[model samples]
Target: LHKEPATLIKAIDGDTVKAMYKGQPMTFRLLLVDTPEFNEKYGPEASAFTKKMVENAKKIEVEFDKGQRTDKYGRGLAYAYADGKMVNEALVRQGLAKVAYVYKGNNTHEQLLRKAEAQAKKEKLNIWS
Candidate 1:
Protein backbone atom coordinates (compact mmCIF):
# COMPACT_ATOMS: atom_id res chain seq x y z
CA LEU A 1 0.00 0.00 0.00
CA HIS A 2 1.31 3.36 -1.03
CA LYS A 3 -0.35 6.76 -1.01
CA GLU A 4 -4.10 6.19 -1.41
CA PRO A 5 -4.15 2.52 -0.55
CA ALA A 6 -7.33 0.52 -1.18
CA THR A 7 -8.58 -2.96 -0.46
CA LEU A 8 -11.27 -4.33 -2.73
CA ILE A 9 -14.38 -5.08 -0.72
CA LYS A 10 -17.58 -4.60 -2.67
CA ALA A 11 -19.10 -2.65 -5.48
CA ILE A 12 -21.48 -0.07 -4.07
CA ASP A 13 -22.56 0.75 -7.57
CA GLY A 14 -21.37 -0.12 -11.01
CA ASP A 15 -18.48 2.33 -11.00
CA THR A 16 -17.85 2.61 -7.28
CA VAL A 17 -16.27 0.13 -4.94
CA LYS A 18 -16.35 -0.16 -1.17
CA ALA A 19 -12.77 -0.30 0.00
CA MET A 20 -10.99 -0.45 3.31
CA TYR A 21 -7.91 1.56 4.20
CA LYS A 22 -6.40 2.10 7.63
CA GLY A 23 -9.35 0.17 9.02
CA GLN A 24 -11.74 2.77 7.65
CA PRO A 25 -14.34 2.57 4.92
CA MET A 26 -13.38 4.17 1.64
CA THR A 27 -14.71 4.22 -1.85
CA PHE A 28 -12.66 4.02 -5.01
CA ARG A 29 -13.83 5.08 -8.41
CA LEU A 30 -12.68 2.53 -10.91
CA LEU A 31 -10.90 4.48 -13.62
CA LEU A 32 -12.28 4.11 -17.16
CA VAL A 33 -15.10 1.78 -16.10
CA ASP A 34 -18.85 2.20 -16.03
CA THR A 35 -20.61 -0.98 -15.35
CA PRO A 36 -24.39 -1.45 -15.35
CA GLU A 37 -26.35 -0.64 -12.24
CA PHE A 38 -26.74 -3.70 -10.02
CA ASN A 39 -30.38 -4.10 -11.02
CA GLU A 40 -29.91 -2.94 -14.55
CA LYS A 41 -29.20 -5.66 -17.09
CA TYR A 42 -26.19 -7.72 -16.05
CA GLY A 43 -25.00 -5.54 -13.18
CA PRO A 44 -25.18 -7.85 -10.16
CA GLU A 45 -23.57 -10.70 -11.95
CA ALA A 46 -20.84 -8.40 -13.16
CA SER A 47 -20.22 -7.05 -9.69
CA ALA A 48 -20.07 -10.56 -8.29
CA PHE A 49 -17.71 -11.45 -11.06
CA THR A 50 -15.45 -8.57 -10.16
CA LYS A 51 -15.37 -9.64 -6.53
CA LYS A 52 -14.52 -13.15 -7.53
CA MET A 53 -11.65 -11.92 -9.64
CA VAL A 54 -10.08 -9.92 -6.84
CA GLU A 55 -10.79 -12.33 -4.01
CA ASN A 56 -7.74 -14.46 -4.54
CA ALA A 57 -5.31 -11.62 -5.12
CA LYS A 58 -2.78 -11.07 -2.34
CA LYS A 59 -2.49 -7.33 -2.72
CA ILE A 60 -3.66 -4.43 -4.87
CA GLU A 61 -1.26 -1.75 -6.08
CA VAL A 62 -2.67 1.74 -6.65
CA GLU A 63 -1.18 4.01 -9.29
CA PHE A 64 -2.40 7.57 -9.48
CA ASP A 65 -2.98 9.02 -12.89
CA LYS A 66 -2.17 12.57 -13.96
CA GLY A 67 -4.61 15.24 -12.74
CA GLN A 68 -7.47 15.09 -10.28
CA ARG A 69 -6.38 12.72 -7.58
CA THR A 70 -9.73 12.64 -5.84
CA ASP A 71 -13.31 12.98 -6.98
CA LYS A 72 -16.11 15.22 -5.68
CA TYR A 73 -17.46 12.15 -3.89
CA GLY A 74 -14.16 11.95 -2.05
CA ARG A 75 -13.37 8.67 -3.63
CA GLY A 76 -9.84 8.09 -4.79
CA LEU A 77 -9.54 8.51 -8.53
CA ALA A 78 -6.56 6.47 -9.61
CA TYR A 79 -5.51 3.62 -11.83
CA ALA A 80 -5.26 0.40 -9.82
CA TYR A 81 -2.98 -2.47 -10.65
CA ALA A 82 -2.89 -5.96 -9.19
CA ASP A 83 -0.50 -8.76 -9.95
CA GLY A 84 1.35 -6.40 -12.27
CA LYS A 85 -1.72 -5.97 -14.46
CA MET A 86 -4.09 -3.05 -14.77
CA VAL A 87 -7.09 -3.90 -12.61
CA ASN A 88 -9.47 -1.70 -14.57
CA GLU A 89 -8.46 -3.28 -17.86
CA ALA A 90 -8.93 -6.68 -16.33
CA LEU A 91 -12.54 -5.84 -15.56
CA VAL A 92 -13.20 -4.56 -19.08
CA ARG A 93 -11.53 -7.59 -20.64
CA GLN A 94 -13.90 -9.74 -18.65
CA GLY A 95 -16.85 -7.78 -20.12
CA LEU A 96 -18.02 -6.97 -16.60
CA ALA A 97 -17.33 -3.30 -17.25
CA LYS A 98 -17.47 -0.64 -19.96
CA VAL A 99 -15.11 2.17 -20.89
CA ALA A 100 -16.26 5.12 -18.81
CA TYR A 101 -14.67 7.64 -21.19
CA VAL A 102 -15.55 10.30 -18.67
CA TYR A 103 -12.20 11.97 -18.55
CA LYS A 104 -11.47 14.99 -20.72
CA GLY A 105 -8.10 15.69 -22.35
CA ASN A 106 -5.60 12.90 -22.53
CA ASN A 107 -5.99 9.76 -20.44
CA THR A 108 -3.02 7.39 -20.47
CA HIS A 109 -4.96 4.12 -20.51
CA GLU A 110 -7.48 5.25 -23.14
CA GLN A 111 -6.35 3.20 -26.11
CA LEU A 112 -5.69 -0.01 -24.22
CA LEU A 113 -8.92 0.36 -22.29
CA ARG A 114 -10.99 0.86 -25.43
CA LYS A 115 -9.35 -2.10 -27.06
CA ALA A 116 -9.99 -4.29 -24.06
CA GLU A 117 -13.65 -3.29 -23.89
CA ALA A 118 -14.10 -3.99 -27.58
CA GLN A 119 -12.43 -7.32 -27.30
CA ALA A 120 -14.67 -8.26 -24.39
CA LYS A 121 -17.68 -7.22 -26.39
CA LYS A 122 -16.49 -9.13 -29.40
CA GLU A 123 -16.03 -12.15 -27.22
CA LYS A 124 -19.73 -11.92 -26.30
CA LEU A 125 -19.20 -11.92 -22.60
CA ASN A 126 -21.72 -11.66 -19.74
CA ILE A 127 -24.21 -9.14 -21.09
CA TRP A 128 -24.17 -10.55 -24.61
CA SER A 129 -26.61 -13.15 -23.46
Candidate 2:
Protein backbone atom coordinates (compact mmCIF):
# COMPACT_ATOMS: atom_id res chain seq x y z
CA LEU A 1 0.00 0.00 0.00
CA HIS A 2 1.17 3.54 -0.81
CA LYS A 3 0.31 6.13 1.79
CA GLU A 4 0.31 9.90 1.88
CA PRO A 5 -0.88 12.71 4.07
CA ALA A 6 -3.91 14.62 2.87
CA THR A 7 -6.05 17.57 3.76
CA LEU A 8 -9.73 16.83 3.37
CA ILE A 9 -11.46 19.49 1.32
CA LYS A 10 -14.90 17.95 1.25
CA ALA A 11 -16.80 14.78 2.03
CA ILE A 12 -18.71 13.95 -1.13
CA ASP A 13 -20.48 11.18 0.74
CA GLY A 14 -19.69 8.27 3.00
CA ASP A 15 -17.26 6.76 0.53
CA THR A 16 -15.74 9.65 -1.33
CA VAL A 17 -13.94 12.90 -0.62
CA LYS A 18 -12.17 15.81 -2.21
CA ALA A 19 -8.75 16.24 -0.66
CA MET A 20 -5.50 18.07 -1.06
CA TYR A 21 -2.81 15.50 -1.70
CA LYS A 22 0.77 16.28 -2.69
CA GLY A 23 -0.32 19.91 -2.91
CA GLN A 24 -2.93 19.10 -5.53
CA PRO A 25 -6.66 18.97 -5.09
CA MET A 26 -7.86 15.44 -5.76
CA THR A 27 -11.06 13.49 -5.57
CA PHE A 28 -10.78 10.12 -3.84
CA ARG A 29 -13.07 7.14 -3.94
CA LEU A 30 -12.81 4.96 -0.87
CA LEU A 31 -11.81 1.50 -1.99
CA LEU A 32 -13.49 -1.82 -1.10
CA VAL A 33 -16.60 -0.15 0.23
CA ASP A 34 -19.80 1.26 -1.18
CA THR A 35 -21.89 3.66 0.81
CA PRO A 36 -25.49 4.66 0.43
CA GLU A 37 -26.41 7.18 -2.22
CA PHE A 38 -28.02 10.55 -1.58
CA ASN A 39 -31.58 9.21 -1.75
CA GLU A 40 -30.95 5.75 -0.37
CA LYS A 41 -31.59 4.41 3.10
CA TYR A 42 -29.14 5.68 5.76
CA GLY A 43 -27.64 7.92 3.10
CA PRO A 44 -27.81 11.16 5.04
CA GLU A 45 -26.40 9.69 8.22
CA ALA A 46 -23.64 7.97 6.29
CA SER A 47 -22.59 11.23 4.70
CA ALA A 48 -22.80 13.03 8.01
CA PHE A 49 -20.66 10.45 9.78
CA THR A 50 -17.97 10.69 7.16
CA LYS A 51 -18.07 14.48 7.17
CA LYS A 52 -17.74 14.58 10.92
CA MET A 53 -14.81 12.18 10.98
CA VAL A 54 -12.64 13.55 8.22
CA GLU A 55 -13.58 17.21 8.54
CA ASN A 56 -12.71 17.34 12.22
CA ALA A 57 -9.87 14.86 12.21
CA LYS A 58 -6.50 15.93 13.53
CA LYS A 59 -4.86 14.46 10.46
CA ILE A 60 -5.86 12.63 7.32
CA GLU A 61 -3.99 9.95 5.41
CA VAL A 62 -4.79 8.18 2.16
CA GLU A 63 -3.56 4.70 1.32
CA PHE A 64 -3.80 3.26 -2.13
CA ASP A 65 -3.98 -0.38 -3.13
CA LYS A 66 -1.19 -2.01 -5.17
CA GLY A 67 -2.51 -1.15 -8.62
CA GLN A 68 -5.04 0.93 -10.50
CA ARG A 69 -4.68 4.15 -8.60
CA THR A 70 -7.64 5.81 -10.25
CA ASP A 71 -11.13 4.57 -10.86
CA LYS A 72 -12.90 4.82 -14.20
CA TYR A 73 -14.49 8.06 -13.01
CA GLY A 74 -10.99 9.54 -12.51
CA ARG A 75 -11.13 9.58 -8.76
CA GLY A 76 -8.23 8.24 -6.74
CA LEU A 77 -8.97 4.77 -5.43
CA ALA A 78 -7.71 4.71 -1.86
CA TYR A 79 -8.50 4.05 1.73
CA ALA A 80 -9.03 7.13 3.86
CA TYR A 81 -7.63 7.55 7.32
CA ALA A 82 -9.00 10.15 9.70
CA ASP A 83 -6.96 10.78 12.81
CA GLY A 84 -5.17 7.49 12.26
CA LYS A 85 -8.32 5.39 12.01
CA MET A 86 -9.31 3.68 8.79
CA VAL A 87 -12.33 5.63 7.63
CA ASN A 88 -13.35 2.95 5.14
CA GLU A 89 -13.65 0.27 7.80
CA ALA A 90 -15.28 2.70 10.17
CA LEU A 91 -18.06 3.28 7.71
CA VAL A 92 -18.70 -0.42 7.39
CA ARG A 93 -18.56 -0.88 11.15
CA GLN A 94 -21.21 1.77 11.48
CA GLY A 95 -23.33 -0.09 8.92
CA LEU A 96 -23.00 2.78 6.48
CA ALA A 97 -21.05 0.99 3.76
CA LYS A 98 -20.86 -2.49 2.28
CA VAL A 99 -17.63 -4.03 1.21
CA ALA A 100 -17.79 -4.04 -2.55
CA TYR A 101 -15.89 -3.66 -5.83
CA VAL A 102 -12.88 -5.52 -4.59
CA TYR A 103 -10.54 -6.87 -7.23
CA LYS A 104 -7.57 -9.17 -7.20
CA GLY A 105 -4.27 -7.62 -6.02
CA ASN A 106 -6.27 -4.73 -4.62
CA ASN A 107 -7.58 -6.50 -1.58
CA THR A 108 -4.96 -5.17 0.80
CA HIS A 109 -7.42 -4.25 3.51
CA GLU A 110 -10.20 -6.57 2.53
CA GLN A 111 -10.01 -8.79 5.60
CA LEU A 112 -10.36 -5.95 8.04
CA LEU A 113 -13.13 -4.41 6.03
CA ARG A 114 -15.01 -7.68 6.01
CA LYS A 115 -14.54 -8.11 9.73
CA ALA A 116 -15.98 -4.69 10.42
CA GLU A 117 -18.97 -5.30 8.22
CA ALA A 118 -19.65 -8.59 9.91
CA GLN A 119 -19.68 -6.97 13.31
CA ALA A 120 -22.00 -4.28 12.09
CA LYS A 121 -24.33 -6.88 10.67
CA LYS A 122 -24.27 -8.76 13.95
CA GLU A 123 -25.25 -5.59 15.76
CA LYS A 124 -27.94 -4.82 13.22
CA LEU A 125 -27.17 -1.16 12.80
CA ASN A 126 -28.22 1.29 10.13
CA ILE A 127 -28.18 -0.52 6.80
CA TRP A 128 -28.14 -3.89 8.51
CA SER A 129 -31.38 -2.92 10.18
Candidate 3:
Protein backbone atom coordinates (compact mmCIF):
# COMPACT_ATOMS: atom_id res chain seq x y z
CA LEU A 1 0.00 0.00 0.00
CA HIS A 2 3.00 2.27 0.62
CA LYS A 3 6.59 2.41 -0.51
CA GLU A 4 9.58 2.61 1.79
CA PRO A 5 13.03 3.65 0.67
CA ALA A 6 16.19 2.38 2.32
CA THR A 7 19.85 1.79 1.74
CA LEU A 8 20.98 -1.52 0.28
CA ILE A 9 23.25 -3.44 2.68
CA LYS A 10 23.55 -6.95 1.36
CA ALA A 11 23.19 -8.92 -1.85
CA ILE A 12 21.88 -12.50 -1.67
CA ASP A 13 22.69 -12.98 -5.30
CA GLY A 14 22.71 -11.05 -8.52
CA ASP A 15 18.96 -10.64 -8.26
CA THR A 16 18.16 -11.20 -4.60
CA VAL A 17 19.24 -8.30 -2.46
CA LYS A 18 18.83 -7.41 1.21
CA ALA A 19 18.27 -3.98 2.62
CA MET A 20 16.73 -2.13 5.50
CA TYR A 21 13.40 -0.41 4.92
CA LYS A 22 11.96 1.91 7.51
CA GLY A 23 14.22 0.24 10.06
CA GLN A 24 12.74 -3.16 9.19
CA PRO A 25 15.01 -5.70 7.55
CA MET A 26 13.89 -6.91 4.12
CA THR A 27 15.05 -9.54 1.67
CA PHE A 28 14.09 -9.61 -2.00
CA ARG A 29 14.35 -12.55 -4.39
CA LEU A 30 13.78 -10.72 -7.68
CA LEU A 31 10.48 -12.67 -8.07
CA LEU A 32 11.94 -14.97 -10.75
CA VAL A 33 15.69 -15.33 -10.78
CA ASP A 34 18.04 -17.37 -8.63
CA THR A 35 21.77 -17.50 -8.75
CA PRO A 36 23.75 -20.64 -8.05
CA GLU A 37 23.74 -21.78 -4.47
CA PHE A 38 26.21 -19.83 -2.35
CA ASN A 39 28.45 -22.83 -1.95
CA GLU A 40 28.28 -23.97 -5.53
CA LYS A 41 31.42 -23.04 -7.40
CA TYR A 42 30.91 -19.43 -8.40
CA GLY A 43 28.06 -18.91 -6.00
CA PRO A 44 30.20 -16.88 -3.65
CA GLU A 45 31.57 -14.85 -6.50
CA ALA A 46 28.10 -14.06 -7.74
CA SER A 47 26.98 -13.03 -4.31
CA ALA A 48 30.04 -10.88 -3.82
CA PHE A 49 29.52 -9.21 -7.14
CA THR A 50 25.98 -8.38 -6.20
CA LYS A 51 27.03 -7.00 -2.86
CA LYS A 52 29.42 -4.62 -4.49
CA MET A 53 26.69 -3.05 -6.58
CA VAL A 54 24.47 -2.08 -3.69
CA GLU A 55 27.14 -1.37 -1.12
CA ASN A 56 27.24 2.32 -1.79
CA ALA A 57 23.60 2.79 -2.68
CA LYS A 58 22.01 5.31 -0.41
CA LYS A 59 18.41 4.48 -1.26
CA ILE A 60 16.20 1.72 -2.66
CA GLU A 61 12.44 1.45 -3.15
CA VAL A 62 10.46 -1.66 -2.32
CA GLU A 63 7.04 -2.18 -3.88
CA PHE A 64 5.14 -5.26 -2.85
CA ASP A 65 2.54 -7.38 -4.64
CA LYS A 66 -0.35 -7.08 -2.16
CA GLY A 67 -2.21 -10.21 -3.23
CA GLN A 68 0.58 -12.74 -3.65
CA ARG A 69 2.53 -11.57 -0.60
CA THR A 70 5.67 -13.03 0.88
CA ASP A 71 7.12 -16.46 0.30
CA LYS A 72 7.14 -19.44 2.68
CA TYR A 73 10.38 -18.20 4.13
CA GLY A 74 8.62 -14.95 4.97
CA ARG A 75 10.77 -12.87 2.61
CA GLY A 76 8.72 -10.34 0.75
CA LEU A 77 8.24 -10.86 -3.00
CA ALA A 78 8.53 -7.33 -4.16
CA TYR A 79 9.51 -5.41 -7.24
CA ALA A 80 12.65 -3.60 -6.20
CA TYR A 81 13.81 -0.40 -7.82
CA ALA A 82 17.19 1.15 -7.33
CA ASP A 83 18.32 3.93 -9.60
CA GLY A 84 14.80 3.74 -11.07
CA LYS A 85 15.24 0.30 -12.64
CA MET A 86 13.75 -3.09 -11.86
CA VAL A 87 16.23 -5.31 -10.06
CA ASN A 88 14.75 -8.57 -11.37
CA GLU A 89 14.95 -7.55 -15.00
CA ALA A 90 18.40 -6.11 -14.49
CA LEU A 91 19.84 -9.34 -13.13
CA VAL A 92 18.39 -11.60 -15.81
CA ARG A 93 19.23 -9.24 -18.61
CA GLN A 94 22.83 -9.25 -17.43
CA GLY A 95 23.23 -13.05 -17.16
CA LEU A 96 23.88 -12.86 -13.47
CA ALA A 97 21.07 -15.13 -12.37
CA LYS A 98 18.67 -17.81 -13.67
CA VAL A 99 14.92 -18.11 -13.56
CA ALA A 100 14.33 -20.70 -10.89
CA TYR A 101 10.95 -21.71 -9.59
CA VAL A 102 10.12 -22.71 -6.09
CA TYR A 103 6.56 -22.12 -7.17
CA LYS A 104 4.80 -20.95 -10.28
CA GLY A 105 4.07 -17.28 -9.73
CA ASN A 106 5.07 -15.06 -12.66
CA ASN A 107 6.07 -16.81 -15.82
CA THR A 108 7.36 -13.92 -17.87
CA HIS A 109 10.06 -13.06 -15.38
CA GLU A 110 10.68 -16.72 -14.79
CA GLN A 111 11.44 -17.25 -18.47
CA LEU A 112 13.84 -14.35 -18.53
CA LEU A 113 15.58 -15.56 -15.41
CA ARG A 114 15.87 -19.05 -16.86
CA LYS A 115 17.31 -17.71 -20.04
CA ALA A 116 19.85 -15.70 -18.10
CA GLU A 117 21.03 -18.75 -16.24
CA ALA A 118 21.14 -20.77 -19.44
CA GLN A 119 23.20 -18.09 -21.04
CA ALA A 120 25.51 -18.02 -18.06
CA LYS A 121 25.98 -21.74 -18.53
CA LYS A 122 26.39 -21.47 -22.27
CA GLU A 123 29.06 -18.88 -21.83
CA LYS A 124 30.46 -20.62 -18.74
CA LEU A 125 30.10 -17.92 -16.19
CA ASN A 126 30.80 -20.30 -13.36
CA ILE A 127 30.77 -24.05 -12.85
CA TRP A 128 29.32 -24.63 -16.28
CA SER A 129 32.70 -23.77 -17.68
Candidate 4:
Protein backbone atom coordinates (compact mmCIF):
# COMPACT_ATOMS: atom_id res chain seq x y z
CA LEU A 1 0.00 0.00 0.00
CA HIS A 2 1.01 3.61 -0.36
CA LYS A 3 1.86 5.99 2.45
CA GLU A 4 -0.87 8.27 3.67
CA PRO A 5 0.24 11.49 5.28
CA ALA A 6 -1.43 12.24 8.58
CA THR A 7 -1.07 14.04 11.84
CA LEU A 8 -1.05 12.12 15.10
CA ILE A 9 -4.04 13.16 17.12
CA LYS A 10 -4.08 10.65 19.91
CA ALA A 11 -2.60 7.41 21.16
CA ILE A 12 -5.47 5.11 22.02
CA ASP A 13 -3.24 2.45 23.48
CA GLY A 14 0.09 0.86 22.98
CA ASP A 15 -0.39 -0.09 19.36
CA THR A 16 -3.32 2.00 18.28
CA VAL A 17 -3.60 5.66 17.41
CA LYS A 18 -6.11 8.14 16.09
CA ALA A 19 -5.09 10.37 13.25
CA MET A 20 -6.45 12.71 10.65
CA TYR A 21 -6.39 10.96 7.31
CA LYS A 22 -7.44 12.78 4.18
CA GLY A 23 -9.46 15.23 6.25
CA GLN A 24 -11.18 12.49 8.22
CA PRO A 25 -10.40 11.11 11.63
CA MET A 26 -9.47 7.44 11.62
CA THR A 27 -7.99 4.86 13.93
CA PHE A 28 -4.82 3.07 12.96
CA ARG A 29 -3.28 0.01 14.49
CA LEU A 30 0.46 -0.05 14.27
CA LEU A 31 1.29 -2.69 11.67
CA LEU A 32 3.31 -5.80 12.48
CA VAL A 33 3.67 -4.98 16.17
CA ASP A 34 1.65 -5.47 19.32
CA THR A 35 2.02 -4.05 22.75
CA PRO A 36 0.50 -4.94 26.07
CA GLU A 37 -3.17 -4.30 26.57
CA PHE A 38 -3.79 -0.92 28.19
CA ASN A 39 -5.75 -2.71 30.92
CA GLU A 40 -3.18 -5.39 31.57
CA LYS A 41 0.31 -5.39 33.02
CA TYR A 42 2.69 -2.94 31.37
CA GLY A 43 -0.26 -1.63 29.46
CA PRO A 44 -0.22 1.89 30.84
CA GLU A 45 3.47 2.17 30.32
CA ALA A 46 3.12 1.09 26.75
CA SER A 47 0.45 3.67 26.14
CA ALA A 48 2.44 6.39 27.80
CA PHE A 49 5.49 5.51 25.80
CA THR A 50 3.56 5.59 22.59
CA LYS A 51 2.13 8.93 23.49
CA LYS A 52 5.55 10.24 24.17
CA MET A 53 6.80 9.03 20.83
CA VAL A 54 4.02 10.65 18.89
CA GLU A 55 3.93 13.83 20.88
CA ASN A 56 7.59 14.40 20.28
CA ALA A 57 7.58 13.69 16.57
CA LYS A 58 7.99 16.72 14.34
CA LYS A 59 5.92 15.02 11.65
CA ILE A 60 3.95 11.80 11.34
CA GLU A 61 2.68 9.65 8.47
CA VAL A 62 0.62 6.48 8.22
CA GLU A 63 1.18 3.81 5.61
CA PHE A 64 -1.20 0.96 4.86
CA ASP A 65 0.01 -2.53 4.22
CA LYS A 66 0.05 -3.73 0.61
CA GLY A 67 -2.78 -6.28 0.87
CA GLN A 68 -4.74 -5.27 3.97
CA ARG A 69 -6.25 -2.04 5.04
CA THR A 70 -8.57 -2.24 8.03
CA ASP A 71 -8.79 -4.75 10.82
CA LYS A 72 -11.93 -6.47 12.12
CA TYR A 73 -12.50 -3.64 14.58
CA GLY A 74 -12.68 -1.12 11.74
CA ARG A 75 -9.36 0.40 12.65
CA GLY A 76 -7.00 0.81 9.73
CA LEU A 77 -3.85 -1.29 9.88
CA ALA A 78 -0.87 0.89 9.12
CA TYR A 79 2.73 1.75 9.78
CA ALA A 80 3.41 5.08 11.46
CA TYR A 81 6.43 7.31 11.18
CA ALA A 82 7.52 10.08 13.50
CA ASP A 83 9.61 12.27 11.27
CA GLY A 84 11.22 9.56 9.16
CA LYS A 85 11.67 6.89 11.83
CA MET A 86 9.11 4.13 11.95
CA VAL A 87 7.13 4.19 15.18
CA ASN A 88 6.37 0.46 14.89
CA GLU A 89 10.03 -0.49 14.68
CA ALA A 90 10.97 1.99 17.35
CA LEU A 91 8.56 0.45 19.80
CA VAL A 92 9.87 -3.02 19.13
CA ARG A 93 13.49 -1.95 19.44
CA GLN A 94 12.73 -0.29 22.75
CA GLY A 95 11.33 -3.59 24.05
CA LEU A 96 8.01 -1.82 24.56
CA ALA A 97 6.35 -4.05 21.97
CA LYS A 98 6.71 -7.36 20.17
CA VAL A 99 6.71 -8.21 16.53
CA ALA A 100 3.37 -9.86 15.84
CA TYR A 101 0.32 -10.22 13.61
CA VAL A 102 2.47 -9.99 10.55
CA TYR A 103 0.91 -11.08 7.27
CA LYS A 104 2.91 -13.58 5.22
CA GLY A 105 3.33 -11.39 2.13
CA ASN A 106 2.15 -7.96 3.15
CA ASN A 107 4.82 -7.16 5.69
CA THR A 108 7.50 -4.99 4.16
CA HIS A 109 9.03 -4.46 7.58
CA GLU A 110 9.04 -8.03 8.85
CA GLN A 111 12.77 -8.51 8.75
CA LEU A 112 13.55 -5.21 10.43
CA LEU A 113 11.01 -5.77 13.17
CA ARG A 114 12.27 -9.31 13.78
CA LYS A 115 15.81 -8.07 14.05
CA ALA A 116 14.80 -5.36 16.47
CA GLU A 117 12.93 -7.86 18.63
CA ALA A 118 15.90 -10.20 18.68
CA GLN A 119 18.23 -7.45 19.75
CA ALA A 120 15.84 -6.21 22.42
CA LYS A 121 15.64 -9.74 23.80
CA LYS A 122 19.38 -10.09 23.77
CA GLU A 123 19.87 -6.80 25.56
CA LYS A 124 17.15 -7.58 28.10
CA LEU A 125 15.40 -4.27 27.52
CA ASN A 126 12.10 -3.17 28.97
CA ILE A 127 9.62 -6.00 28.32
CA TRP A 128 12.39 -8.47 27.74
CA SER A 129 13.90 -7.91 31.17
For model 4, how does the per-residue alpha-carbon lDDT over 41-79 read when each residue is reduced to its tens digit? Answer: 768988998898888998889988777788789998888
* Local distance difference test, candidate 3: 0.64
Over the stretch 47-76, how does candidate 3's per-residue lDDT look in tens digits?
775676566445577766445657788777
Better model by TM-score, 2 or 3? Answer: 2
Residue pairs with backbone overlap in model 3 = 99-113, 99-114
**Candidate 2 lDDT for residue 3:** 70
TM-score of the candidate numbered 1? 0.79
The pairs that clash in candidate 2 are: none
Per-candidate TM equals 0.79, 0.97, 0.68, 0.94
Which of 1 and 4 is the better model by TM-score?
4
Error of 3 at 54 (Å): 1.5
Better of 3 and 4 by TM-score: 4
Q: Which segments of model 1 are wrong by more than 4 Å? A: 1-5, 9-14, 21-24
User: Going through the candidates in order, what is the number of backbone clashes in each?
Assistant: 0, 0, 2, 1
User: Quick one: ranking by lDDT, best first?
Assistant: 2, 4, 1, 3
- Model 2 alpha-carbon miss at residue 74, Å: 0.8
- RMSD of each candidate? 2.9, 0.8, 3.5, 1.2
C-alpha local distance difference test of each model: 0.71, 0.92, 0.64, 0.88
Clashing residue pairs, candidate 1? none
